[PDB]
Amino acid sequence: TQPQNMAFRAKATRTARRESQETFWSRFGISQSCGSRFENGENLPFPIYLLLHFYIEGQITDRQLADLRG
DNA sequence: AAAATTATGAAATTTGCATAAATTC
DNA sequence: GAATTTATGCAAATTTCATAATTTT
Numbered sequence: 001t002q003p004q005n006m007a008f009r010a011k012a013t014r015t016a017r018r019e020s021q022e023t024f025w026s027r028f029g030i031s032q033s034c035g036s037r038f039e040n041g042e043n044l045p046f047p048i049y050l051l052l053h054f055y056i057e058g059q060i061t062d063r064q065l066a067d068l069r070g
Numbered sequence: 071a072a073a074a075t076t077a078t079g080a081a082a083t084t085t086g087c088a089t090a091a092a093t094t095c
Numbered sequence: 096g097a098a099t100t101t102a103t104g105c106a107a108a109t110t111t112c113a114t115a116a117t118t119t120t
Contacts, residue, residue: 020075031111036077045085045109
């Protein structure tokens with residue numbers, strides 16, 4: 001049931017942290033447009049669902065992601 | 071109304087289906 | 096050589112760039 005709702009959850013987190021789509025989605029290497037289409041109910045591919053899941057529950061940290069970008 | 075943010079059409083890239091090739095047993 | 100595993104051409108679905116529309120300040 002959850003994969004269809006996860007993007008909306010993701011949006012609520014981001015909103016609550018007062019982050020742009022660019023800021024939030026790019027930690028995962030996901031573009032702003034793509035973030036926009038997910039937040040409005042485009043099919044969330046399973047790997048992105050997994051990442052959002054682990055992120056939202058606090059198991060993957062912003063710092064871990066920032067380390068991996070660089 | 072300018073700046074910043076989000077949404078969208080369409081080109082290009084990526085994925086997964088069919089199945090061909092290869093490998094294992 | 097059959098079963099199983101892996102690779103590959105290509106259709107289709109997905110991503111992103113370019114930018115339009117919207118929202119914020």
